[PDB]
Amino acid sequence: SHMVTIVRIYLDGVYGIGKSTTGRVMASAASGGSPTLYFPEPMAYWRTLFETDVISGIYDTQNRKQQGNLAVDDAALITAHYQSRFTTPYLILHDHTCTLFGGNSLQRGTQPDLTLVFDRHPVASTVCFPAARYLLGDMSMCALMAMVATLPREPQGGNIVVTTLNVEEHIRRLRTRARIGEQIDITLIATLRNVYFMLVNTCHFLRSGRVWRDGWGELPTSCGAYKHRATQMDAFQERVSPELGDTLFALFKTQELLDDRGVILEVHAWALDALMLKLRNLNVFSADLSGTPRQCAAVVESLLPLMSSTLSDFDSASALERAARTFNAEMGV
Amino acid sequence: HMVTIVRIYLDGVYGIGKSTTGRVMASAASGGSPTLYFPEPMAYWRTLFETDVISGIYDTQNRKQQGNLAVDDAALITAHYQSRFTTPYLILHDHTCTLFGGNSLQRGTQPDLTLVFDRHPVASTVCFPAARYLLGDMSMCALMAMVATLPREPQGGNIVVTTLNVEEHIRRLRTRARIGEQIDITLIATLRNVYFMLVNTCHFLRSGRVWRDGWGELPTSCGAYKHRATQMDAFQERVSPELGDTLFALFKTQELLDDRGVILEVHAWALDALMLKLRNLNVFSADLSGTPRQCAAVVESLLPLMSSTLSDFDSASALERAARTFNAEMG
């Protein structure tokens, strides 16, 4: 009933950069600042709650394909389904929490009563990782469209912080984390890194008032060469003034989505319209994570004066605290 | 200068005559006030991409029921095809949802504009997935993944679930064009039960009850439950349903409970979401045992009972364009 000001932050980016550790420090009292709740990756939902481990499954699918115990056509389909299952616990969490944030989104500049830090936004599993998989040829455009369509609309007041890190230190971090001689999917990481820069650029692009049709006619179709560039290490970066070719929209200009005359079908244009509207309420930032976890938390926290806050109330904030405790407990190990 | 809109989602098991009814309703030959029809997105499912999902989901069961494909793999691939059914619905729903307007009310009048949607997103995100789960073609994990993608219906929705006696249903299924679709009676029986569960869920919610109401007392829905749900006429429309008569009952399974037998909070959230998303669907059923003209008349008799919203002229014009576009690209 009593009013509460909330900043919510979705910390996102490529696996292995130090996002989860940063988020945990933010939530720790030792980092000071605002009282903060942290919602971890839904690890148990992915790995232990059901019969199948989707993380093992998605990586194992590609191995079964390369050796030849599973056909390429079948593998593409199984990969898409695994990618679908990644999104589930994010969609559930989003549906539960979006009722509690309240409205009256504004950039207030002041310190909130409390901060929420979500480990990833639903865009990670519905858009970024599917896009990476599509660009690498592990699943089709059809499958991509199917995941992208399931991106939920962000209500007013969202902030997304995309984590960045020089690639040498990124791979170092993955290396220390990995077992004795464990390989790292460098090609996947290179692509995901570009996809997250595309995401950042997309949000910047929309905030400048531009739309996916702006520069669409003039854009080259995104066939073999676009895909090579998209998997190329450091090919994309955060742009000051991004144009269409720097954003997620560019990959959708492929023959698969055009009529004979090369015009996008209207149904596909509607999908891009939906994608555009769903991302509108995301106030976008980027954060370098080269420092210590304490330093990383401070870098993110120092963004709060530029972030959107909403006005919730004590009962809803209390429900969010209960939600965080429940999600931390149930999603553990 | 408001435009009064009544939107109808005609839904139910395939083969019952729903699309024919919808076309008749929108046909100028049937007169009335201006009516638009949005067909099943057949081209999206069948021809727009390299794979046809209707033959693909059937073919998958065939490979399973033979050499080609292992049952674990078939279950994942079947879930993927089921996801692909939802896509054009999600896209259409995202495009039209802001156009309907607010001020949902049962006004009892003829609307300025009637919209007939062939199926609601619930069909592909919940009903067909649930049938596949109950039949053992998909896991509960796979079902949860589809169910979580159901979009929230904004105020003013009406759903008309079509009904038909088993004998006429079987007769009509035999009339259908050959498109490589699965057409067995155990599937039909299950879909009919699941659509009764859906109607009952809507009645249950409108009665002022929530899924926890009767949850504790409800038997755990494991192997026996699944068998019952595949039995022709195991379920029916009840305007005063028990929890066991709704879609909620199939979620009280071991897979979703802790060791103490209490549903996990995360799964409880998924039921809350389902409950909330169905809130704005005013539910009706219509028997389609008449002729195409008779069927349309039965559905039209429901209009004065339905919710209408108030939209502006530009929004209505855009809905008019959207039906034109959709018919053009989906056929």
Ligand SMILES: Cc1cn([C@H]2C[C@H](O)[C@@H](CO)O2)c(=O)[nH]c1=O
């Ligand atoms: C969020 C997400 C993670 N992952 C993988 C990357 C990591 O190996 C692991 C945890 O982030 O899951 C996906 O493959 N797809 C996804 O959508």
Ligand SMILES: Cc1cn([C@H]2C[C@H](O)[C@@H](CO)O2)c(=O)[nH]c1=O
């Ligand atoms: C909407 C829908 C239809 N179908 C099938 C039933 C019919 O064979 C055909 C057309 O409705 O597609 C599904 O298998 N899943 C779905 O979600």
